[PDB]
């Protein structure tokens, strides 16, 4: 009865939205960038190799100074490295070893991590006495934590396998806001440059744009075939890129409200695990299950280069805020720095 | 540049302290063995825990050897993302309630989950210890033939007990036939793939406090031995 009527309403609304999207698609990105000169050959080399993790690494994050970084391994360790001179700055043992994400605060005073324990732990690095200690444990998710990112020293946004996202207040330790609407595990998130919006990707093959203050979804983007594993904004904040289990990467425009370009090749049949842009946004770097990383031309969808120095699955990737270097982490327990 | 030299010296000293601590932690990590316990709603995994958040941990020791077993707590029933965390464990312990052949078909669901685990690309080197639990209920249901194993598994008509079967004392031949048919169902999946990189170790359990941990200990020893033997081209 009413359920069938609601289904019909939903189908008609989807048809209308698709019609509007087709109406706005007057041209493509390939036709417009036809006369642009190619980047050429990108040949990056390994400058550092950071050793010391006992088991596979899942996550890393650069500090805002573009020198220090933090890495998380499922041996139970969070390690903070000085990428200059390779020396280890900190080594934090965790209560639970099944960590799946880590984040480094922009101020440089805190780090965060979580995983299969369904808890987000905050560690203070600038304590007066003794080594680093846990300062806060955010609980309330009913599934594993997949990603976290600091907004300020007092705000953090987390994504979970319970199909929701949350915005916390660190001092009180309570969920300030909850973001619902996804139907699968939320695998990744990325904050906008102004920290007013953020995007999330889930195991329902869809991405969502969320307003931080109002706590509501602005736009939904479809076009992938399988689960979305990674996501990141374009430098100007008007577009973003997604990597999927369907062995493709995709570019979506916020104002055009649809997909712009697809990056794929016939010989790539493995999933993407991580994506990132270069400083100017011309290059798109993607990590793959076939042990390698690909450097794509973001405007012409041509493969410009390959980073091929890992013996196991590439799990995480990150570009410094100054655009000087790229860092890759792998299941072989090593971290590599490229430029 | 003097303060720069002092900063380098302090950073190096901190790095050496961290590296010594990491050496100790590496020793500890290599010593212990990690297990993943996976069951079902009423498979009896809690009894296995009793014999002895998002994840629960049980620690035990056999012959001065340390085992840490992890069981999933508050996670959703979709596993294809978090199961990947357990590609480095020494074994997955898979608990199956064998009496519930008549969701109304739980044995088939267990077989599907076993097939998915066995054929996952990231678990290609992980061995499975299979615990077929609740043998008393299976015997009681077989003897009182109210519900037939047939017409849920039509092949059971053409099944004969293996000549190498070792029945427990005081077992009707029908109960032995049923047990070994159920075990052969899993062996059909586990012996078709692997190329000798990982194996399945099935056991029959009803209720023993100290036999199950001994079985796990022996299975882990066999797993390590077979890996070493395969390294040396003796297997």
């Amino acid at each position, epitope marked *: 009865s009413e359920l069938d009527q609601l*289904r019909q309403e939903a189908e008609q609304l*989807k048809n209308q939205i698709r019609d509007a999207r087709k109406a706005c698609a007057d041209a493509t990105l390939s036709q417009i960038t036809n006369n642009i000169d190619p980047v050429g050959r990108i040949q990056m080399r390994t400058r550092r190799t950071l050793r010391g993790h006992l088991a596979k690494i899942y996550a890393m994050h650069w500090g805002t100074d573009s020198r220090l970084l933090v890495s998380a391994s499922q041996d139970g360790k969070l390690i903070i490295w000085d990428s200059y001179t390779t020396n280890k700055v900190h080594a934090i043992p965790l209560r639970s070893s099944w960590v799946m994400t880590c984040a480094y605060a922009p101020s440089g005073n805190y780090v965060a991590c979580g995983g299969l324990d369904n808890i987000c732990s905050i560690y203070n690095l600038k304590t007066r006495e003794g080594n680093v200690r846990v300062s806060r444990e955010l609980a309330g998710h009913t599934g594993y934590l997949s990603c976290c990112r600091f907004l300020d020293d007092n705000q953090i946004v987390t994504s979970s396998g319970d199909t929701t996202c949350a915005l916390w207040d660190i001092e009180t330790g309570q969920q300030t806001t909850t973001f619902t609407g996804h*139907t699968g595990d939320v695998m990744s998130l990325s904050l906008a440059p102004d920290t007013r919006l953020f995007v999330s990707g889930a195991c329902d093959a869809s991405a969502k744009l969320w307003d931080v203050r109002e706590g509501m979804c602005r736009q939904t983007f479809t076009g992938h075939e399988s689960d979305i594993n990674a996501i990141c904004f374009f430098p100007n904040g008007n577009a973003f890129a997604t990597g999927s289990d369907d062995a493709t990467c995709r570019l979506f425009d916020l104002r055009a409200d649809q997909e712009l370009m697809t990056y794929s090749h016939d010989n790539i*049949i493995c999933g993407i695990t991580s994506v990132s842009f270069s400083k100017s946004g011309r290059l798109l770097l993607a990590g793959y299950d076939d042990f390698n990383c690909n450097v794509w031309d973001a405007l012409k969808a041509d493969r410009a280069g390959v980073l091929a120095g890992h013996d196991n699955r590439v799990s995480c990737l990150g570009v410094t805020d100054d655009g000087m270097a790229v860092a890759t982490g792998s299941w072989d327990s090593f971290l590599k720095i490229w430029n | 540049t003097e303060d720069q030299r002092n900063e380098e010296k302090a950073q190096r000293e901190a790095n050496k302290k961290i590296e010594k601590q990491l050496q100790k932690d590496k020793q500890v990590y290599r010593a212990t063995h990690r297990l993943l316990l996976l069951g079902a709603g009423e498979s009896g995994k809690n009894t296995i825990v009793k014999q002895m958040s998002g994840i629960f941990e049980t620690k035990f020791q056999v012959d001065k050897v340390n085992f840490h077993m992890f069981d999933v707590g508050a996670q959703r029933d979709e596993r294809r993302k978090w199961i990947q965390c357990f590609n480095d464990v020494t074994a997955i312990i898979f608990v199956v309630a064998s009496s519930s052949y008549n969701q109304t078909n739980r044995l088939q669901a267990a077989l599907k989950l076993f097939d998915s685990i066995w054929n996952n690309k990231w678990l290609r080197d992980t061995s499975v210890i299979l615990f077929l639990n609740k043998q008393d209920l299976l015997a009681e249901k077989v003897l009182a033939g109210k519900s037939k194993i047939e017409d849920y598994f039509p092949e059971f008509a053409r099944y004969t007990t293996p000549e190498d079967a070792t029945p427990e004392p005081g077992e009707d031949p029908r109960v032995t036939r049923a047990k070994y048919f159920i075990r052969d169902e899993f062996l059909r999946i586990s012996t078709a793939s692997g190329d000798g990189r990982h194996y399945c170790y099935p056991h029959f359990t009803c209720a023993v406090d100290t036999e199950n941990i001994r079985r796990v200990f022996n299975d882990c020893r066999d797993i390590i031995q077979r890996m070493h033997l395969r390294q040396y081209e003796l297997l």
Partner: nanobody
Amino acid sequence: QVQLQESGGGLVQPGGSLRLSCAASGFTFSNYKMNWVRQAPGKGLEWVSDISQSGASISYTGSVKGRFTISRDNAKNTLYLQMNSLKPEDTAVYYCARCPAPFTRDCFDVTSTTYAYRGQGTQVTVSS
């Protein structure tokens, strides 16, 4: 957007025959293994049948062997289930389900509650 629509089904007397169709859109059909799953009144989801990418490998659950046949046509992106000798135990809602990822042999969560890559299902009732 991934989309699966199931059609066919209705009232049928015991011993009758029926055909269910599944039309797929939004993905490369030939790269995925496919599944038929069912949910009976007041029971959980139950796996029924599956067919591989090229259709060479086919599997059925024990209680439907000899009565159900699964088929697929990659050219028209369609999946078919032919049901023969129906019984009142077959009254249920039938769903068409896709493997989560392409180019894989494992198929994890097709019978889970709120699985993403599943259709809305069609009702089959067997009564005299």
